[PDB]
Design a protein around this ligand. Structure first.
Ligand code: CYC
Ligand code: CYC
Ligand code: CYC
Ligand code: CYC
Ligand code: CYC
Ligand code: CYC
Ligand code: CYC
Ligand code: CYC
Ligand code: CYC
Lengths: 146, 68, 160, 145, 160, 161, 160, 161, 161, 160, 161
């Protein structure tokens, strides 16, 4: 109930910072959140914001992180991570032609850890950590998925 | 009217079903005479084997009492 | 028989026998003596009916007793008369039974497959049964004629 | 305990489209053995289909060509999908004797229900233990024709 | 095999083989004399084609032999090359067979389920089988290439 | 199942001769039974539940079976036993009307002891209940066919025990 | 009725009527005027039978007309007598029909649920029906008495 | 189940050996003769009913088996035995086409011997009918496929006995 | 089907929005009333037969419906009417638990008016019975959940009428 | 009980235990202490509650203690009190078990056949259970009495 | 489903005529165009998945279908594509192997508009996706076999719209 409402409200109030830390960590060569339209493992082989990817890839890159954060709040209000895992079950096959999967998994890890930073770990810090861990767990393998 | 009491195992070798496939891989069930042939052919078609057949219900004389 | 059919129906319904079901038994047991008399008459005249049925069959369907036709030889004709006697015995069984399930479980199920394997003319066998029915009507009374003709027409319809 | 009743009441709902315990009817004779260990759920469903209760309810008021379409939804959880299928099942229903192997208790509804239950599709999806269920949009790939 | 496939349909429909089915059963054997040497040439390259395919696929996808790769290390490379040899053997078994039977029945029905707990890239296996198909025809003539290309197409058409 | 007429028909049909005077007399026996069986069956069907109640009262009720630690204890098991008792009464009436006990071996006795051994049903209590049952039913229908009912009841008891 | 039952079974098996079914139809049509006379007698004695069955039922179970009784009060007893008249009418319908299809479709299927809904004693209603059976058999000859009463015990067994 | 080619393939796949000279010899030995198998199968399919006819005539019918008392009494049992005869003939044709008795071992002999024992079927009469079918088939097909059909007919007869 | 939470989440997903303050306040309102609905549903489940009891006694029986010619005449029609009335009660309970009429629209209301028109069922009488159980449920549940229960019964009655 | 139904539903769904499904488990393990306290508070007065429900039942239903009733006589009255104690034991079983499954499997399935064979008033038994509920609710606190009355009313609806 | 061979026979059978010169010309034309069809079928296979990906990139993706609200907004809606497609391939590869519309009208394009209307699924978008695959298969297959594949794809698109 009201705990879940407060948890999702706390994510929504500063969702920008959570995406910002992950984007700045995995994207080097500029400011990733200048490309966000809201303003309007060997982990990283850091893509350059203009050289390797380009603007059209950059917009998808910035959008999908905020989309992931939004669906986490969706499942948080929901009872289970079904909305998450049904949407990240076969996602890497779509992504991997233009995806650094190892780059994205470390971004998800940073997102989970930063979201845990916000809360006091009553049950809230473990809840968001468990929900975001579902995305990474269902994403990695490339063969247990789909 | 008579039901054969048999036991058999039938493995599925083309689909690898993933839920409660233990009650469907070995069974004993009374099957009528009129349906026993078509039921027994299914086990052989699937690839399993029948372990035993027992007439159970009736007599081997047949003649009257066969119909049902 | 009627008892077997009624008991089977009530057993399938999971209940004791219905008011039609009991009265069908009382009427059958009331008719039993005349059933036995008709059976006694047919059994006593069993050879004459078979002979006249064979005569009428071979006079109405000569193609069977022609070259080919599965009834050319003397042994083949004897076998055909034996089959007519078998169906007469089945009719006598059914009359005393009161229903036709004993006939169906013995000589009516698979008859098409067997006669197609042998290539015997099933319409010819039906004609023989019709001749047997005519002989029985000639050698019986009226009400007994109707009662036996019910089973004879059942055999004719089953061979169809 | 309490699971055999749950399975049996689901069987009535799937076969007759609703529970008959509300009215008070039941196939008591074949009901006991499915609980009881002799015949499987497949045999129990076949006895339910060829029982008098199903004949009075889904064979009397309908045409044969409608009885086929209702039996497809009752014993297979789907609709007839082709014209050739309808010809096969109607020719199965319509004749007095079809026979399969040996015996001939195969008339109308009895022959059709045997053909439906012994089909390759039935014993690949609802084989031998499972009460048949609707294979609607959520469950399987839905045909569009 | 073709005979197995035909007899499967015949027994499933409970009937003898068909008039158009024996025409195909006979045509499957008349080209067997030509096809026998076709797989024989591929048979006598078995430890060479896959060996040269290793350098062709691992150079293309360089993440299969890297620290974050599934085939990192000598013994891990050996498993991938042994898989390539297995699939080459199976495809030869099928080309000396006819229909998809030897590959589909043994090592095709459930590769997704095997890799489900094994973590080996299906899109990489697609290029591996593509490369195998490309490096095995050149030993053959174009006349044999026509009798070889579809037999290799099935693996990369099925896993997809 | 084979009734008396069907049984005689089969008996002379496997041998392969027309029915004769012996068969006529044997069928005449059942024909001269004269619906006393159907009257007795009608009476038993009329008062079936009373027979079950009295038999249970003089078989198992007010005893260890109906107290804790019993196969009769609890409503589910009691309902199963009473349904079985109704099964025995109905199939006994069926065999009594048919004239032949083949139905009892067909579906009323075949594997019944094995199922009871698997479950835990006391055979002796059921047998004694059936023993009181033939007494109550014979008191009900009358002495004309009481012996006829008792022969099928004894056949069922012998098969069960 | 017997006609409906036989025709329904023949249609369900997809066949013409059996000779045994035809014989039962003949017996049923033969017993028609006797059945009609029995039904006419019961219809003419409908009110006395209901009243005497009421007295017998109240004597056997006066508790039902007690304060903790379902039929406590003159209006509840009038409803009980009305149900009694309903069941007598159903018995006459069954008598003319020769079977229990109309009786079953009208007054037993769901009767347990309805009487549980109304909190009424089903054994008490069965006792009233048996009292009706006694009063009705008191006004008929022996064969007719057995004919009506055996329908009455069909009703009693169904309410069980 | 398996034929010659599939048997060679999986028999080599069990120890993971490529097709060698002996394997290709076995495959060539199969392919060199299967055309006669095709002709024999076509002739058998065209003359199936006559084969069952003459096998029954010279081995089963005109005997006490078809007389009242035998297993072949009543048209029901007659049709059942002739259907079994047809099934044996068709599976023998399948085995002859495939060049491997795995089809007979799976879809023919599996669950048949003890079933015949439980049903009272005469195994000796069934074997005699099988040999009658083999004789008629050998007469029809000719020298080209006579032994090829006869080997699998003997396989079925020996499996039954 | 859908409920309050699922409806809100899908309504914001279709736009592509984060769950804002208004959505969290609607979930505020749904969550603060949760236990009242649960206890009301428990009371309804515990007293389901008696709610139908008084509803039938106050709206249907003792009228022309139960007499001959009425729709609810005969035991079959009486059992069917009570089963329908129970269906309405149970689905109203589901709608009250979910906080949404989508389940009622999806699995009850569609086909209902057309089926009743086909069979001749009096829709006015059905609406009266639904109002009867609405009054009974309001009496049983009490002030806490009376309105929340009654709104879905009113929805069902308005959809039928 | 709760665990059995949750695991059965999950296994029928062919998946692990749902996160929501484990929530009922956590709630049960939380409320186990309170339900055990309520269970002992009920068990400490088994004969007293049976007593007071006895006065309520006898005063409400002189039918049962009437000459036509089943409680006429101290022996069968004692039997009725023993049945009431049995049902109190069943309801305390259900209270400790968290699900009504033990109650369903001990005393409501076939209870109708029970009391019909015994010729006993089902409404009278329900009235006794309701009086037991009233006495128990007076003996406990309101919040736990809500769940206790839920169990008792489930029993009352079951015997009806 | 019909091919050219079956279509000519069916057309010449309802009017009861033997195969004349025109029928033999149509069958001869199909037999002469019987190798490019087989080759282009294999070419469409293998490169099927890349064809679908390129067609999706060319028509479907980079539009409103991917933004919030579209019918391919999330995955599983994206996943219903590639599926949905792989049909329109698969089929019409069947068409350009047994060349006749027939199959495309009986299995794929029949009630598809009704299903799409009941499920959302922009028909104009799914027709643009079809034309994209038409272009990609015309590019991959070859100069002469680009046609009749263009024919079947155009038939599919026109029938859908
Ligand atoms: C795995 C560690 C080992 C192994 C196993 C293996 N199993 C099968 C086939 C079946 N396994 C089951 C299992 C179950 N049925 C149930 O009901 C349950 C519990 C609910 C279980 C665990 C069944 C019934 C089958 C037969 C049907 C089917 O194939 O699905 C196989 C396949 C055998 C075959 O090819 O026929 C195998 C290989 N094999 C190993 O090497 C391991 C030691
Ligand atoms: C005579 C009117 C017709 C006719 C008959 C015919 N029958 C046979 C051979 C057989 N007939 C039977 C019959 C039965 N077996 C049973 O169990 C029953 C049911 C009681 C019957 C009726 C059998 C078994 C045979 C086979 C031989 C045997 O009995 O052992 C023949 C001989 C065919 C042949 O090829 O030899 C004939 C000619 N033929 C006619 O033309 C009439 C229409
Ligand atoms: C009491 C409120 C009502 C009542 C009851 C009554 N019961 C009997 C006899 C028996 N009751 C039972 C009950 C059960 N067996 C079980 O397994 C369970 C579940 C736990 C129950 C409740 C049984 C078995 C008997 C038979 C005797 C025995 O226990 O051995 C009687 C006596 C009937 C007789 O004919 O003697 C009575 C009177 N009577 C009322 O008036 C109340 C409505
Ligand atoms: C009664 C006098 C005794 C008794 C019986 C008892 N039986 C069961 C359970 C079963 N009984 C059957 C029986 C049959 N099913 C059939 O179809 C047939 C043939 C007509 C029979 C005989 C079976 C299979 C069951 C299991 C399913 C069921 O309950 O219906 C029980 C209950 C056992 C349990 O709880 O599982 C009981 C009590 N027990 C006695 O102590 C009496 C002396
Ligand atoms: C009388 C011997 C017993 C008895 C009966 C009783 N009945 C009611 C109320 C109703 N009974 C019916 C019955 C039927 N509807 C049908 O369609 C049929 C089939 C022909 C029947 C038998 C109905 C519909 C009612 C409801 C009222 C109405 O008819 O409109 C009551 C009144 C119950 C109450 O007021 O709560 C009673 C008492 N009571 C006894 O004690 C006898 C054993
Ligand atoms: C015929 C030459 C002999 C004969 C046979 C006979 N068979 C049956 C019954 C059955 N026969 C089978 C056979 C098979 N099942 C299989 O899977 C296969 C191979 C694929 C076979 C051959 C079966 C299953 C049955 C029982 C079911 C059924 O018949 O539908 C009978 C009937 C026995 C009876 O009356 O109970 C007979 C008579 N009889 C002879 O006289 C010949 C020696
Ligand atoms: C009762 C208060 C009123 C009444 C009702 C009545 N209904 C039927 C028959 C049916 N009712 C349903 C209802 C449903 N099926 C569902 O799935 C749902 C929603 C989940 C509902 C509401 C159906 C399908 C039927 C037909 C099949 C069946 O009988 O089960 C009848 C019987 C009509 C008849 O005799 O043919 C009746 C009487 N009648 C009244 O008078 C009341 C106002
Ligand atoms: C993809 C380019 C477009 C699109 C499609 C879309 N389709 C569905 C769902 C279904 N599509 C089908 C299609 C078929 N079934 C058939 O049998 C055939 C021919 C053989 C076809 C073409 C069906 C039946 C369904 C429903 C069942 C299923 O999914 O298999 C969806 C899913 C809709 C939903 O979420 O419920 C989608 C999205 N969407 C786009 O944006 C493109 C324009
Ligand atoms: C809420 C869960 C969810 C997601 C995330 C999702 C993603 C998603 N990403 C897509 C594309 C894409 N996504 C990306 C890129 C990226 N993707 C990332 O998650 C990274 C941040 C980044 C790489 C670093 C690119 C480049 C494409 C275009 C397709 C291509 O790569 O060829 C597409 C195909 C349609 C399109 O082009 O928009 C989907 C459906 N759908 C879902 O249901």
């Amino acid at each position: 109930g009201q705990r879940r409402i407060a948890i999702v409200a706390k994510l929504t109030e500063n969702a920008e910072m959570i995406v910002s830390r992950a984007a700045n960590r995995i994207f080097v060569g500029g400011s990733p959140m200048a490309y966000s339209e809201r303003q309007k493992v060997p982990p990283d082989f850091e893509p350059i914001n203009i050289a390797r990817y380009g603007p059209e890839r950059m917009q998808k890159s910035i959008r999908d992180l905020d989309w992931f954060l939004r669906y986490t709040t969706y499942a948080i209000l929901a009872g289970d991570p079904s909305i998450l895992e049904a949407n990240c079950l076969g996602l890497r096959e779509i992504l991997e032609k233009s995806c650094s999967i190892s780059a994205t998994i470390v971004a998800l890890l940073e997102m989970r850890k930063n979201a845990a930073r916000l809360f006091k770990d009553e049950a809230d810090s473990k809840l968001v950590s468990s929900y975001i861990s579902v995305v990474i767990r269902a994403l990695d393998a490339d063969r247990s998925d789909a | 009217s008579r039901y054969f009491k048999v036991t058999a195992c039938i493995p599925s070798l083309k689909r690898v079903r993933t839920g409660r496939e233990l009650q469907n891989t070995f069974f004993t069930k009374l099957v009528p005479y009129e349906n026993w042939f078509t039921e027994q052919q299914r086990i052989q078609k699937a690839g399993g084997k029948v372990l035993s057949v027992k007439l159970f219900t009736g007599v081997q004389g047949a003649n009257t009492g066969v119909g049902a | 028989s009627v008892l077997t059919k009624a008991i089977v129906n009530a057993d399938a319904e999971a209940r004791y026998l219905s008011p039609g079901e009991l009265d069908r038994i009382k009427s059958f047991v009331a008719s039993g003596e005349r059933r036995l008399r008709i059976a006694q008459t047919l059994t006593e005249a069993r050879e004459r009916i078979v002979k006249q049925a064979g005569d009428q069959l071979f006079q109405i369907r000569p193609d069977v007793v022609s070259p080919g036709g599965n009834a050319y030889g003397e042994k083949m004709t004897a076998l055909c008369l034996r089959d007519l006697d078998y169906y007469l015995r089945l009719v006598t069984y059914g009359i005393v039974a009161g229903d036709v399930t004993p006939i169906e479980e013995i000589g009516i199920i698979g008859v098409k497959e067997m006669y197609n394997s042998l290539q015997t003319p099933i319409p010819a066998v039906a004609e023989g049964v019709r001749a047997m029915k005519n002989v029985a009507t000639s050698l019986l009374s009226g009400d007994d004629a109707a009662e036996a003709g019910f089973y004879f027409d059942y055999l004719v319809g089953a061979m169809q | 305990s309490d699971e055999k009743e749950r399975v049996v009441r689901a069987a009535y709902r799937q076969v007759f489209e609703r529970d008959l315990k509300a009215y008070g009817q039941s196939v008591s004779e074949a009901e006991s053995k499915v609980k009881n260990g002799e015949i499987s759920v497949r045999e129990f469903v076949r006895r339910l289909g060829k029982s008098e209760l199903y004949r009075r309810e889904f064979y009397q008021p309908f045409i044969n060509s409608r009885v086929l379409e209702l039996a497809f939804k009752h014993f297979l959880g789907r609709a007839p999908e082709s014209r050739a299928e309808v010809q096969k099942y109607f020719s199965i229903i319509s004749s007095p004797i079809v026979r399969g192997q040996s015996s001939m208790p195969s008339g109308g509804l009895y022959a059709l229900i045997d053909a439906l239950i012994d089909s390759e599709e039935y014993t690949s999806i609802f084989g031998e233990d499972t009460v048949p269920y609707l294979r609607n949009l959520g469950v399987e790939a839905q045909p569009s024709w | 095999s073709v005979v197995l496939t035909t007899i499967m349909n015949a027994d499933q429909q409970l009937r003898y083989p068909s008039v158009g089915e024996l025409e195909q059963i006979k045509n499957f054997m008349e080209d067997s004399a030509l096809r026998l040497k076709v797989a024989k040439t591929l048979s006598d390259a078995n430890d060479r084609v896959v060996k040269q395919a290793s350098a062709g696929l691992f150079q293309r996808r360089p993440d299969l032999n890297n620290p974050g790769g599934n085939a990192y290390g000598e013994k891990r490379l050996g498993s991938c090359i042994r898989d390539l040899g297995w699939y080459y053997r199976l495809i030869t078994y099928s080309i000396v067979a006819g229909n998809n039977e030897p590959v589909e029945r043994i090592g095709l029905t459930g590769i997704f389920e095997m890799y489900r707990v094994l973590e080996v890239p299906i899109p990489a296996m697609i290029e591996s089988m593509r490369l195998l198909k490309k490096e095995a025809l050149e030993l053959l003539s174009p006349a044999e290439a026509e009798i070889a290309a579809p037999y290799f197409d099935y693996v990369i058409g099925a896993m997809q | 199942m084979q009734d008396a007429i069907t049984a005689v028909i089969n008996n002379y049909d496997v041998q392969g001769k027309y029915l004769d005077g012996a068969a006529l007399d044997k069928l005449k026996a059942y024909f001269t039974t004269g619906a006393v069986r159907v009257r007795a069956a009608a009476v038993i069907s009329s008062n079936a539940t009373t027979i079950i109640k009295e038999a249970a009262a003089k078989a198992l009720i007010y005893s260890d079976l109906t107290r804790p630690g019993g196969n009769m204890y609890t409503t589910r098991r009691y309902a199963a036993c009473i349904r079985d008792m109704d099964y025995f009464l109905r199939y006994a009436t069926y065999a009594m009307l048919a004239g032949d006990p083949s139905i009892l071996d067909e579906r009323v006795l075949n594997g019944l002891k094995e199922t009871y051994n698997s479950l835990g049903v006391p055979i002796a209590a059921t047998v004694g209940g059936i023993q009181a049952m033939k007494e109550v039913v014979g008191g009900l229908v009358g002495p004309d066919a009481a012996k006829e009912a008792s022969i099928y009841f004894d056949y069922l008891s012998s098969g069960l025990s």
